[PDB]
Write an enzyme that holds these catalytic residues in place. Structure first.
Site, short mmCIF file in Angstrom:
data_model
loop_
_atom_site.label_atom_id
_atom_site.label_comp_id
_atom_site.label_asym_id
_atom_site.label_seq_id
_atom_site.Cartn_x
_atom_site.Cartn_y
_atom_site.Cartn_z
CD1 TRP A 64 54.03 -54.34 39.48
CD2 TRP A 64 55.92 -53.38 38.91
NE1 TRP A 64 54.52 -54.71 40.29
CE2 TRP A 64 55.63 -54.64 40.76
CE3 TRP A 64 56.80 -52.36 39.21
CZ2 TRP A 64 56.46 -55.08 40.22
CZ3 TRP A 64 57.93 -52.83 39.44
CH2 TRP A 64 57.77 -54.28 41.02
CD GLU A 80 37.99 -44.89 24.40
OE1 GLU A 80 37.43 -45.48 24.90
OE2 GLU A 80 38.65 -44.76 23.38
CG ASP A 107 38.82 -51.72 36.19
OD1 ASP A 107 37.42 -51.49 35.15
OD2 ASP A 107 39.45 -52.24 36.52
CG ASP A 138 36.84 -48.80 19.96
OD1 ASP A 138 36.49 -49.04 21.56
OD2 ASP A 138 37.33 -47.82 20.07
CE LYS A 139 39.37 -50.12 15.57
NZ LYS A 139 38.45 -49.70 13.75
CG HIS A 154 49.54 -48.66 21.21
ND1 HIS A 154 49.53 -49.59 20.20
CD2 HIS A 154 49.66 -48.89 21.87
CE1 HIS A 154 48.86 -50.76 20.71
NE2 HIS A 154 49.06 -50.32 21.87
CG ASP A 155 55.63 -43.05 20.83
OD1 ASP A 155 56.02 -42.87 19.80
OD2 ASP A 155 56.03 -41.54 21.83
CB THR A 198 35.68 -49.17 38.14
OG1 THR A 198 36.99 -49.65 38.53
CG2 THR A 198 34.48 -50.19 39.55
CD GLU A 233 40.07 -42.85 21.55
OE1 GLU A 233 39.83 -41.73 21.87
OE2 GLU A 233 40.24 -42.37 20.25
CG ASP A 270 60.36 -42.02 19.09
OD1 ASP A 270 59.44 -42.48 19.29
OD2 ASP A 270 61.24 -42.98 18.08
C1 HEM Z 1 51.45 -56.03 27.36
C2 HEM Z 1 50.86 -56.42 26.47
C3 HEM Z 1 49.77 -55.75 26.04
C4 HEM Z 1 48.79 -56.05 25.41
C5 HEM Z 1 48.80 -57.47 24.67
C6 HEM Z 1 47.26 -55.50 25.86
C7 HEM Z 1 46.57 -55.16 24.83
C8 HEM Z 1 45.14 -54.25 24.38
C9 HEM Z 1 44.51 -54.52 22.86
C10 HEM Z 1 43.61 -55.65 22.98
C11 HEM Z 1 43.58 -53.49 23.85
C12 HEM Z 1 42.12 -52.71 23.12
C13 HEM Z 1 42.81 -52.49 21.95
C14 HEM Z 1 41.12 -52.08 21.08
O1 HEM Z 1 40.33 -52.98 20.98
O2 HEM Z 1 40.52 -51.39 21.16
C15 HEM Z 1 44.03 -52.28 24.81
C16 HEM Z 1 43.79 -51.23 25.26
C17 HEM Z 1 44.44 -50.44 26.50
N1 HEM Z 1 46.00 -51.07 26.69
FE1 HEM Z 1 46.64 -52.38 26.63
N2 HEM Z 1 47.82 -54.13 26.61
C18 HEM Z 1 49.16 -54.18 26.48
C19 HEM Z 1 49.90 -53.62 27.44
C20 HEM Z 1 49.46 -52.05 28.15
C21 HEM Z 1 50.44 -51.36 28.98
C22 HEM Z 1 51.60 -50.95 29.41
C23 HEM Z 1 49.40 -49.90 28.63
C24 HEM Z 1 50.74 -48.41 29.18
C25 HEM Z 1 49.50 -47.73 29.05
C26 HEM Z 1 48.34 -49.75 28.07
C27 HEM Z 1 47.70 -49.73 28.94
C28 HEM Z 1 46.40 -49.42 27.60
C29 HEM Z 1 44.65 -48.82 27.74
C30 HEM Z 1 45.09 -47.45 28.66
C31 HEM Z 1 44.27 -49.00 26.78
C32 HEM Z 1 42.87 -48.65 26.65
C33 HEM Z 1 42.36 -47.74 25.44
C34 HEM Z 1 41.18 -47.09 25.28
O3 HEM Z 1 40.29 -47.15 25.90
O4 HEM Z 1 41.16 -46.22 24.04
N3 HEM Z 1 48.16 -51.91 27.35
N4 HEM Z 1 45.59 -53.70 25.50
C1 LIG Z 2 47.29 -52.41 22.22
O1 LIG Z 2 45.88 -52.57 21.27
C2 LIG Z 2 46.03 -53.87 19.98
C3 LIG Z 2 45.43 -53.50 18.92
C4 LIG Z 2 45.50 -54.89 18.07
C5 LIG Z 2 46.13 -55.28 17.65
C6 LIG Z 2 47.02 -55.87 19.13
C7 LIG Z 2 46.77 -55.16 19.67
O2 LIG Z 2 47.80 -55.70 20.83
CA LIG Z 3 39.37 -49.72 37.40
CA LIG Z 4 58.45 -44.51 19.56
#
Ligand code: HEM
Ligand SMILES: COc1ccccc1O
Ligand SMILES: [Ca+2]
Ligand SMILES: [Ca+2]
Length: 317
Positions: free
Chosen positions: A164, A36, A187, A175-176, A47-48, A189, A40, A62
């Protein structure tokens, strides 16, 4: 150069990263695991970094999301991000690196704990953040493909690069999106940086892993996996479908493009020639051992093929 504990690194100013590496492996990543905290921290790099907009401002990668957590964690799209920010902030107080540097270093170190993973190029010397990111710059799961592409395009990413970057969802859970089933992975895995994510988002939706009314969520193909509406649409959109499918059973491409694209993202708002290369400080990830596959008992007919030029590869199930 050779550091004080005998560990070596190409540029002497990288030496100060080694005690930081040891600290985070034991105390952020709970013994160098790909669980986890790693997922995160990886989400945190995005997000940064993505708070960067030619017309509105933001300094990109930054550290503003820590330095100005009070503001930035108030944005709906940063829902859930406070946990990993408060976990990371003490490390930044305690060590001598900027918050921008720390967020990228911990994300890269983390990804290196995952089988199949890569060493994201890492550069040292980001000045402290000097402004909060503007509001509304982080994409969400309920945004359309056009809106996600225009936002990422605005920060310097083309549609193939958005794809990519989404290999990160190979090690990810939500989580949310559905708070009744927190921790449900994208996925099969979530501890393995592989192509299962591009395969599984291509299957026809069957069910909802928890409740059915959730904004930003699509039907999943598997009890036990959750699917974002955005991933659902990106995997099927004529702008992104072919690149999506080209990732399947293509781990060399996923590795190459993810490392390069994360690197570009890690440098949003920054200039690498003003910074010092400390890439060789990131650990060597484990390799994959198991083949890509459809989930057992699924077949090609379960796949919603969306690339007109190239049929979906024949995987075993
Ligand atoms: C391109 C548009 C993207 C959308 C709409 C998107 C949306 C999301 C959402 C909704 C979650 C789940 C948050 C929650 O409810 O806990 C998430 C998790 C995640 N995102 Fe994306 N994401 C995007 C791109 C990216 C990018 C570019 C990265 C690159 C690092 C990224 C890395 C992750 C990782 C590692 C998690 C898992 C976090 C965890 O398990 O604690 N995401 N994303
Ligand atoms: C990436 O995490 C998010 C969390 C809540 C709403 C939109 C998102 O993209
Ligand atoms: Ca995987
Ligand atoms: Ca920033």
């Amino acid at each position: 150069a050779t550091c004080d504990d005998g560990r070596t690194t190409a540029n002497a100013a990288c030496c100060i990263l080694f005690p930081i590496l040891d600290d985070i492996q034991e105390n952020l990543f709970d013994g160098a695991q790909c669980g986890e905290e790693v997922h995160e921290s990886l989400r945190l790099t995005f997000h940064d970094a993505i708070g960067f907009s030619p017309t509105l401002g933001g300094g990109g990668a930054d550290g503003s999301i820590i330095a100005f957590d009070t503001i930035e964690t108030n944005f709906p799209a940063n829902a859930g991000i406070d946990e990993i920010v408060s976990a990371q902030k003490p490390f930044v107080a305690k060590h001598n690196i900027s918050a921008g540097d720390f967020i990228q270093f911990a994300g890269a170190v983390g990804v290196s704990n995952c089988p199949g993973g890569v060493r994201i190029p890492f550069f040292l010397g980001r000045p402290d953040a000097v402004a909060a990111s503007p509001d509304h710059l982080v994409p969400g799961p309920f945004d359309s493909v056009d809106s996600i592409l225009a936002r990422m395009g605005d920060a310097g990413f083309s549609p193939v690069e958005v794809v990519w970057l989404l290999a990160s969802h190979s090690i990810a859970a939500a989580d949310k999106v559905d708070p009744s089933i927190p921790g449900t992975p994208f996925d099969s895995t979530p501890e393995v940086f592989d192509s299962q994510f591009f395969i599984e988002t291509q299957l026809k939706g069957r069910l909802f892993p928890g409740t059915a009314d959730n904004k930003g969520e699509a039907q999943s193909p598997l009890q036990g996996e959750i699917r974002l509406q955005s991933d659902h649409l990106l995997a099927r959109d004529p702008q992104t479908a072919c690149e999506w499918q080209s990732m399947v059973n293509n781990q060399p491409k996923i590795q190459n493009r993810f490392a390069a694209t994360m690197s570009k993202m890690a440098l949003l708002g920054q200039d690498k020639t003003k910074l010092i290369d400390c890439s060789d400080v990131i650990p060597t990830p484990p390799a994959l051992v198991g083949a890509a596959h459809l989930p057992a008992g699924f077949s090609l007919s379960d796949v919603e093929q969306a690339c007109a030029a190239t049929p979906f590869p024949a995987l075993t199930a």
